[model samples]
Target chain A: HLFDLSGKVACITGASSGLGRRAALTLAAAGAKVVGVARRADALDNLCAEIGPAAAAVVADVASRDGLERTVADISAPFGAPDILVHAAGVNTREAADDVTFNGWDQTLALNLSAPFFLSKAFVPEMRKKGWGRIVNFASLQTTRAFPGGIAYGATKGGIAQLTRAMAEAWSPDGITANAIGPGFFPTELTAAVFEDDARAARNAAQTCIGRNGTLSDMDGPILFLCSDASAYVTGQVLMVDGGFTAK
Target chain B: HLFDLSGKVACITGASSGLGRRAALTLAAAGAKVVGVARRADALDNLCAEIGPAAAAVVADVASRDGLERTVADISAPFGAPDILVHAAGVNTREAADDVTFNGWDQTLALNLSAPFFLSKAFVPEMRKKGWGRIVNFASLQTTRAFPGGIAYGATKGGIAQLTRAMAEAWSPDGITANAIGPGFFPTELTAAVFEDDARAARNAAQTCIGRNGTLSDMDGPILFLCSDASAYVTGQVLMVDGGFTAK
Candidate 1:
């Protein structure tokens, strides 16, 4: 019963692919009406079709202020405002270290950090009204670590880790608890570069205490826990679903 | 408020000093009746007197199995039963790796690993019946990284990390969420040496991304989140209240 979400409405960004999509399905499977958002409608449409009636698709970019407002409108158009929000969308995921420009850096910050806050703010009023809400942000290993090409990316995620804590401080009293989940090497399009090279992937696996890379299935437990009553007292934290990757 | 613990009962071990005493006060301030347990009844009595009648004291050693039973009876005598359990009682702390005796190692494991489990198991049935409870363990930086003189301490904390996860995996379904708070350098009895030296303390401060060592007050919000209805959907996690020390 702690994991149940039958009457809840969940809106997940980055629902077109990877872990955000996984988060959408995870919550939907537990009975939430899921609104999946991504840059393109087709991918989300395909996702919605696969997930059936309880699922809907929204097309919106999360890379700017205007896009955030538009996406908020689209998210609320279906099933009213969502009680649960999973900001799984990521952009400009792999900008090379020296190749970085203001454009790539700006997109990363806007999509990853700024949008999650304003988006949560846009919908938090209804959550306050209903007296319950869960806001989950998709963080990364870069949240704490400095990788070769992860400067802007790492900084963006780092912003998220603190943003999550600050949001919990400001909004949890209104019944909306905010948290973040950091992932390890999973075979999503976002991390395909790391996972494609067998040796690199193996090295990453070896780095974790668990001796393996993560599977999408590994995130379900953490997602459900933070998105349901099981996490009632949990807020302003980042749960690394990395198979002990960061632990050791 | 979502962080309110108004009518709940909390039992905290190691409540006579340091983080345990701090955790006891944090929960009591949030409106929970606290049953403080420690080796010295006198110290606990002082804590109770300061906190008023809503706080009570129990004396017992946490490192031995037999003492656990007496502690249970002593705890329940005043509060009926605890809805929250915080394992802040640590023994054999500050032991250097080179100086560790088998006895010291045994006490470390028994108190830090075995005691949290058994003490929690003693009260878990009521939580299970009610379909809600909170379990908080005090973990350290050693839980993830080995320090210069931290072998036995590392071993115990590592066990607590997995023990917490395993407990969450096992008990989260019953509405009892298990979690740990891994604090960085907060001035307490356990790490007086680290804080006493100004240069060493500043070095520790610089080690954190937030550019500071932790204040004891930094922990209250996090502890409350994990212990209150605000984190209803969260379980099986260790929230590092370390001022981003691990982030760097």
Candidate 2:
């Protein structure tokens, strides 16, 4: 019953594709006024059309703070200050630990970790003044487990884990809760490489207690839970929606 | 760098058996003065012998108010107040949802939920005075997923996920962090039924992304992180130590 999101304004980065797009849709369907922000104008426009008047598009570079202030302003223009912020723009610079360069590490961390913090900081005043807000940062399986070619990506996700906690410690007392979602092997654009391989996908599906990869609908329940009063007391927590993949 | 637990005093309920016993040993090895509490004095003694001077024992029922009060007092006598509190005492009534009796529900609730709360409240003042505390509640796979013969047990574990959040909401400002650990299938007295059948046990092991069930030692890192300064800014979180069982 707590999944209600009526009249709430929400902002999502990387809302053109992957889990980010799914989150944008999930919230829109739940009655949120969603602002879809991404680097791609075409994709964001498509998403806005799909979601109708309840959704808007703000094309921006989530990987750089170069124009973040303007980007934040653009996002808030249509929907006022978003009371719900989902930092879904992430880049997994699939650089092996040995192959990672300064630029690759910086790019991955900027979008995946730093953007969540800075972007949320931009709206803190509104959230605190309103005395209620929900911030859902996207974490990953790499947040805890080290996989090949995921060192930089893992570092960023790992950082988001603590950033979420620190954000809660700083902001939750003001009635704003900061939490993260660590997703498992969901078939999104980000993981299309893994899913395209039959053997790999089969192996991944076999890893969960539920015996399958996640459906897009699976994200809906968790998104609503963290975004609504059902999680009124929940803060600084990471809810893994990986179909019991981490429970073994 | 987040796994150190030296000089902290830890109090763990259900220490004579199952995960609690492993937890007690884990903290002791990490250089904590571990206070082991359980109904069986003999088991606690055996545990103490194994842990040497680093361990203390308190015998009491975690389900009864009177016994819990007495147990809380006994725990205080040894260490003044524990820096870490692991509410591990729990029971699986195994009653079907439709057939659940008030007694079964109450027993499960008291030990699984109430004990964590009241016992934690007991030592909170000391924690506040010291300006640091860690409360780790034992959650189960049932905390989020429903299983047959676990209706009563699942309710309390479900309550604990939110309970941990509420505790953090109320207490994190005072330097204490509240978190829960959701374990997957591991060999314990609690899960004897699931493990007794070789097929079922293997099935459970096959369900994690890591392709195996958890070892007691798998818990050591996560527990130490929650209990130590490494998770200093981390609060109101539930970390599943289930080897990717829920990550499908």
Candidate 3:
């Protein structure tokens, strides 16, 4: 399979539930050692239990700097070092521009922007030493287009789009590659409000050239390609996993 | 006047002749303080003389570390610091993969890749302090699509695409934007090999959805946007000024 993950260790944040949890399960099934991190210990434990011995869980809030450092350390201890780091931890405070509070903006930037940089810093040195690594930072349609209530969240995602390149520049000569996947409307905790409304979901689907909202399975191919040697030359780029949402 | 550059200080590398010279003329006509740099002192002096006192010339190679440092120091001395930087200097040995020599590879990377970084680094500290700057790196169609006898050239162009983004990440927070423009089949010294054969050029044009090869004027819009405040929110992007060739 072009998307094979055999013989790789992947550390995925926000993996206790939703899209992160599903990605953990999928990666584990593809023969990766999946180290899942999230704030809910019980949920993470349940997810790991379901995925069997190849999967483990760490309870930590990746949004906080201290939490990120501890989580990275714990994940590394079990897996030696992650060959793949998937920064799926993020929040969307769907507050309108007028309603955006300083707290909301700070929290959004902390998780979506700051955490990824610190986490990548922790793992990239080892990846560089090994002459191979993959860092996948999550992006969204908001990375290119703005939404009414996504001002704070969109800003962080936009920053992440560039941060992926910064990671690539700092590390590509050492053989580690960093890229981002800007996913379209996918059903997850982050978009529960939109998914719960049929009209909104359909509207998003129509907005994409592919005429559909993304399935969890849509990410498998791109994620594996990015996390493996297949993408050795492809770094510091955002591959829109959105089925051509931005093409229009 | 959407493309106007009145009162802006612009510096262009390789401005003694070819595309760099044309860009210098364009910027100077638009009321910019243009500083032109190249290895040929006489040619550069002639170019500046034609463009009048609003334009000046500095003789330096730009492909070497020392040459770039000296060139940047000279350019900055009169203009204070360039608000607009156009990296139009590049070289392509046109060597195939198996035929690439170490010296050929080194020269291509030095001119096409390393020099941009060194030049940007020299000016970006000041740009960041001032909270506004624009760096436009020249990319080519070979950035994404490979061609025979273009291995080294393609590698450097590909690196430039990412390097532009890396610059944005490091500097955009302070309002310095870095972008690249990938030109298509244009009649330039670099495209001598292609334009020499009319049928081959026509074939290349037919391949694009736009059904035509690019003219020098095709670059004006994208170049102006990147070099001005029009692209303030757009950073770390490679806008293909290619008449939508890749889109097809």
Candidate 4:
């Protein structure tokens, strides 16, 4: 009952692939009118079609603010104002600190950090008016633990932890709770490099306290918890649903 | 049975007060022969006395490498090489980045980061020989989330996250698991400044999903879980017993 989303409308970015795709379906199953946003039209269209009438697709790149105003309008057109905004769009350049290019750094920042705040800010007015809202940001293991060649990605994620808190500090009184979910090693397009290599993937599995990598379904309950009344007092936190990967 | 510590001997640094003190008592309650280490003779002696014959006090400052060999010897004298090592000794200057002093930075790193590694390294051989060991480090909220006036302290804690991982990577194959516990706002000596202020403390309480600050007893189960067989597969992780304070 705490996780019921009967009347809620949810918007999820990066819904073309990976965990974001998983989150779109999960939220839709929980009774929310889901709007899936992504850059790839084919993938986003397929996802919305799969979810039937409950879901709609907005094909747009959220990695920059250039067209976010129009993007926001498109998002609301499908499902009114989304009470649950999932900033699942992110990019990891995997550039070593020294080799990190300016463009890569800027793109990573724009997608991973800036989009979450700006998009949430754009939707905050409606959320505040309704006196209820949930903003879920995608964080990573690199948010706390440093990984090889994750400098730019980690920096943005580190900012995400605080940004979640800063958002809570600024908007919780208005009933908008900002939180993050830091996933461990999951089989996703973003982590294809790791998952593609057998030994590397095995080593990652061995590293978790649960002795395995995360399955996509591992994220459903946590997302629902933060999005619904289940986590009414939960705000400004980054819950690692990493099969105890970070725990180890 | 997973938490039974009948034959496990644990050496806990910073056992004089705060969560360290609670850890010593908690581990001992789970049937361990605990060696309580601290710089304060009076407090350490009081703790050992409270725990009766099952506990012993070793007064030494682990904030530096100075006299560590002697300290290690004293640690082993009371109990045959401890298989469970809890590195709880630490210092937080709480100095802002610009205001951070050399001594404060060094001390914080030495105690929070270096001591955990060095102390565990000293006891690692015996743990490796037995093919079973548990090393628990103390991490902080600052490990990932930044707070005002916590630069040096946060840096050390951030390092602890990695150190714990490195330790597990190095020693978990030998049956030695390394992990950390990142506590929320608990009413301890380290947080005396926080609890001393009613409004500040109340704000902290309101921030957690559980709607309250941590109670010392809340740590008992988690401590026993990691130090005992309950956490055999759990290594290189920092478990935050923060009532989901970090969840929001």
Candidate 5:
């Protein structure tokens, strides 16, 4: 239990599927009371049922301001307040520079950037009071590099890097730390297009110093470090959990 | 002219002393119209006189909101918005954990954290409109490592690492890029305590992979890179200009 989560509660957004669902299960396995939120109710319920009583699921969209408020309220009901908040939810419009629409741009920003901040606003006061908390925001390869069809997604992910810092500034004095995990190419639904093309996936893998794409389990060590007391002094950092993708 | 600043308008805060004054002279020598801001009118006047017609001085405190706004407005009037903004103004309370007072903490946060953001806000919109700008934030060893007597200073320096990212997110889309330079121990006012003791200074030099503390001139290359089109794609990054101090 070097990275123990016993007696801790975690609220994970976008837990219906993909990275979010996997993180929910992982945190629960570590003995945390996991509250999962997503737009898909049936999938979330299935996840909770599998994880047993230690897990709870709520159906809510995090993109809307009110949805975020409601989700926070529901998650806080069971556990007084979450000791860990993971904004694993995000949208990748995959619209190219010339084809990006205002709607796609706004939607990408709302879900990826705005939602995380609003959710933190709901739980940070309690964290400040308790003098302990961990916030993990999702960042992307787009956070540092540009790709063909990722204008809107890159913008929001880029914003996540900053939002992560602002969160640290607003809360670190109270013993709450905020950081973002910038993942390289992983086999998530958001990256299905690249994974579908074997050559493209290989190209991304080759670009990293480690010469490989990330496995879902690769996130466990980083996630745990940020969410637990192991990272007590590390705040406002963008830890590239990308097999050294940016190192090259 | 690879690193030319000829005819560019450069504004530097805390320019009456220390690294700020050195940076001011460096930029002026490189052919920029340098505007220096500080509370000491006499010191600023001396700096302007020394730098000749290429430089000007403004008397204002960046710690207060009104002071920053008025100072920025005044600089903007003379030089039309600055093409380059260097945030070098900072305060080290040198207050330990149990010894930190409200006033000491507030002053450190005000001068180091809030002022950078406010100054950037004043000039960024215009930079965005013009389609080019460079923001260089000054980070320190304290940005990552914690020292016994630098709790307040460390908090703000750590915040700058993320603040640089946030500023990049908010403005990079409009051709304005923000980055930070994290310097290793250099002989400046900030390191007066360390430099005063030969053994302590040698310890710092040995800690860095390069086996030496930084010289003031060591910053020139990094400064030029961030302030020019050479780093167009480099944003939201903290380049450790520390002779690889953090590498080990």
Candidate 6:
């Protein structure tokens, strides 16, 4: 029962593809009704269809807060207010510092940082009323390490680290826990460039203590723990599902 | 000889006390000419006097970039352009998220994050010309975790993580290696409040994998390694000298 979510409703952003889609599947398999949110209607439709009745698609750009009221209403239309909010949405513009533009920085921050916080804020009151909530934000290797052409992305990821802690500090007393998962190089759309270069990907795999980059399944254990009663005592922490990539 | 710093000129900010003063002493002992910078005149004077003739003092507030040219000149006045830069200067306002003020956030970012990058930028050209440089920024356990009153401080520390990487990515090709040191709870003036409570201090010590909090001597090895040829290939990394506190 520690990991069961039989009657729980979970909302996952960036669920159109990559890790986000995987997160939706995992949560649904754990018996939580999941609503997948993304800007891509076709991808979101595919995800919801694949998960059958257990999944619902909310086609909207979570990076924009202009119509948050409507967005939240639509998210709740599929399931009741989400007790588990997984912010897997993010973007990496891959701009070097000297070449970084204001727009790049703004968009990155909007998607990676603001969307997570604002979305959580929108749903937190309902969770507080219910006296239980699980919030998981996505962090990255860039949260603690910088890569070439990741200045803007790195800054937001770094901000996510504190945002997770600040959220925990502000909401844990109300029965909501905030945490983040720092994933190592998984072959997601965001990292297509790295995976395309076989040598770079291999080098990354060899760098981890486990000598391998993460597989989609690698995130399941951590996601379940943080999203269930199993991690009741774990709040404001970043569990790096990185195969000990950060261990070195 | 891998750790020796013979004939090297080193600039260390926050050198008036705490880890910064210790860094000056350590580098000076390693045969480097050290320039200690801080806002406190008396403390800088005392540090220089303690290090004997191999050390000099430059008093200034590094949080502001308006006088960077003059600051760099004064730093170089001690012993020419520094081949090593250690950013040990930092502050923790300890404000909660809801209570955090704009000034607190701005000051924290300026001191803990901006100062390190701008200071390094000022001296990077010289290090590039010399084909060698060692840049070390101070990170924290907060970089990866959050404390009750460390929203702003945690944000800046998180930024320090990626800032170190970006700097490495930008400057390492020119032989300027950038890295960070994330210290565990060492009893310094900044952590005076923590050590003041014996139970709190003990709890911190218990959290470490080594079963004890850090001592000043614990930092010596890491500092020497990152500042010398021993870490020639360790650019853009965060060496947590915390008795593996983060391991758990």
Which has the greatest lDDT? 6
Best by TM-score: 6
Full-model lDDT for every candidate: 0.81, 0.80, 0.79, 0.83, 0.80, 0.87
Candidate 4 CA-lDDT value: 0.83
In model 5, which runs have C-alpha deviations exceeding 4 angstroms? A1-24, A30-248, B1-6, B61-69, B92-118, B124-134, B142-179, B196-198, B209-212, B215-240, B243-248
TM-score for each prediction?
0.52, 0.52, 0.54, 0.55, 0.58, 0.71
Worst 10 residues of 5 chain A by lDDT: A96-105
Q: Please, what are the lDDT tens digits per residue for candidate 2 over residues B107-178?
A: 765677656766887788888999999999987777655566665576456557655765776678789998
Instruction: Supply the DockQ value of model 3.
Output: 0.03
Candidate 1: where are CA atoms >4 Å away? Answer: B1-248
Clashes of each: 20, 17, 0, 8, 0, 0
Indicate the worst ten consecutive residues by lDDT in candidate 1 chain A.
Answer: A92-101
User: In candidate 4, what are the lDDT values of residues B92-134, reduced to their tens digit?
Assistant: 7876533555467557656775567667777888988999999
lDDT by residue (tens digit), candidate 1, A1-248: 89999999999988999998999889999999999988888888889988999999988876566576777888888788899999898864565433555467557656776577667777888999999999998778766555656655664565566557656756788888988889988989688888899999999999999999999999899999999999999987889988888887
Say which prediction, candidate 1 or candidate 4, comes out ahead on TM-score: 4
List, residue by residue over A1-248, the lDDT tens digit for candidate 2.
57889989999887998788999999999999999999889999999899999999998996565787898889899979999999888887676533545577557655765567668877888989999999998877766555556755664565566557656766788899988998898888678778889898888898889889987778988988888888989997889999887787
Residue-wise lDDT of candidate 6 within A113-133, one digit each (tens)? 667767887898899999999
lDDT of 4 by residue, A1-248 (tens): 88889999999999999999999999999999999999889998899889999999998888655788899999999779999999888888887543556577568766876577668878988999999999998878877776776755765676577667756766788998889888898888789899889999999999998888888999888888888998999998889998788776
Candidate 5, residue A202: the lDDT equals: 91
- Candidate 6 residue spans exceeding 4 A from truth: A1-82, A96-126, A141-147, A151-174, A182-189, A192-248, B1-4, B39-79, B97-110, B143-146, B155-173, B202-222, B230-248
Looking at candidate 4, what is the lDDT of residue A46? 91
Query: Is candidate 2 or 4 superior in TM-score?
Result: 4
In candidate 3, what are the lDDT values of residues A1-248, reduced to their tens digit?
65677888999998976678877877888889999999888988899889989998887887765566677789988777998889899998886543555477558767886677667777877887788788998978877565657755665665566557656656777888888988888888898699999999888899889899998888777777788777888998889888777887
Badly placed stretches (over 4 Å) of model 2 are: B1-248
